[PDB]
Amino acid sequence: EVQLVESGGGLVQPGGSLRLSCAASGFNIKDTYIHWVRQAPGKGLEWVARIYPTNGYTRYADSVKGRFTISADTSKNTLYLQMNSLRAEDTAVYYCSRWGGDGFYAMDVWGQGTLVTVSSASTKGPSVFPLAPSSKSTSGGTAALGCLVKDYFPEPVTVSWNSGALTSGVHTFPAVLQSSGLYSLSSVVTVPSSSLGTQTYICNVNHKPSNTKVDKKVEPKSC
């Protein structure tokens, strides 16, 4: 199988430089045109640059020429995007893709992407808080519980429940940027009220950016 992998993204200060990389397997990059396409969070797909590795010709989008450079090393079968003068508008997920060539001049192989977030703000790991049941009145039918994963930078965080065993009616919401520039999310789960207290509920929050890995056991209260 034909794949494409990119790497090198991360939190970068405005005005810095970054080199993202894209490695092709299963095909020689020589034969093709390789593209770098980004997608800002929530927005559309935007094209950034093309290179033809053989004669080495390149083409840039206007928002990016000058400051970015796409290059390729055909012996290392890898390709690179040197990004300079980075702006907060360069926060996006970057994918490289192959234009087909042989019958299909559309982009058939796409990488998984790598997130570049351009900010002055510091990595901060989450405060994990419980969202306990029994808020005033205890027990009934289905009861919900969860974890509020507060104030962290950048993204992502991952939330698992009982170290990947409770997967059922588990709702990990979207992160919201707070007024502060810090994210927050909640992971909630619905369980029997019979199980509340026969069973423990822990949520496993991991923030790979700040090397935080929290476990917080959610158990019931009364008011």
Binding site: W47, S97, Y105, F129, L148, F173, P174, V188, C223
Partner: protein, 214 residues
């Protein structure tokens, strides 16, 4: 550049329905249009290249077409796993440009939200903040109205909502409103209520509690 304009911007369609998404190029782009599918937190994938040819391994139910400068993707029988954002693209000129996307969601029967309200945790409260949270679980349609009332006084802009993508098991959505205040304001009021109003909700449900580590 060449502007690709796509309509609709989003659509609900039930399973079994014929769906039709259109992109209209800004100029004759001839037949240099490819259509992409993008499943949440996943890369694009080619469905159709040069207006109308299917990519190898894509189900017979997708098809594309050209009429002048209008290009159409049609899914004859929408399956529940075609939940996605479809994008068109012209590759006729540099730059390649993309339509702004069409989010296809699955229509299903109106379910009411179950409503859970959750007071703030004591550890949070030490840090001098109280985040009251209101959960509306497994409902449809997506629209719902969550109003916060603190001692009957209905709150403005201290609330932020977040919604799950559509579930794929049962096509429902979930939603959390988070009221965040200072523990100094949290502690001068008593009843914190979350009034929910939904379509499958006969009458506005109210989930509430009385303040404190009581």
């Amino acid at each position: 550049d060449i502007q690709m304009t796509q309509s609709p911007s989003s659509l609900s369609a039930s399973v079994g329905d014929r769906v039709t998404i259109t992109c209209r190029a800004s100029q004759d782009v001839n037949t240099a249009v490819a259509w992409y599918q993008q499943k949440p937190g996943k890369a694009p994938k080619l469905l159709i290249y040069s207006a109308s040819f299917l990519e190898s391994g894509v189900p017979s139910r997708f098809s594309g077409s050209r009429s002048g400068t209008d290009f159409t993707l049609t899914i004859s029988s929408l399956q529940p796993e075609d939940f996605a954002t479809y994008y068109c693209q012209q590759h006729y000129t540099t730059p390649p440009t993309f339509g702004q996307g069409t989010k296809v969601e699955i229509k299903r029967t109106v379910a009411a939200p179950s409503v859970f309200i959750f007071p703030p945790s004591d550890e949070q409260l030490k840090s001098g903040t109280a985040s009251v949270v209101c959960l509306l679980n497994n409902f449809y349609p997506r629209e719902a109205k969550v109003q916060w009332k603190v001692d009957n006084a209905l709150q403005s802009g201290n609330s932020q909502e977040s919604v799950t993508e559509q579930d794929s098991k049962d096509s429902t959505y979930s939603l959390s409103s988070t009221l965040t205040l200072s523990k100094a304001d949290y502690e001068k009021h008593k009843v914190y209520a979350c009034e929910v109003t939904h379509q499958g909700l006969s009458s506005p449900v109210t989930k509430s509690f009385n303040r404190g580590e009581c």
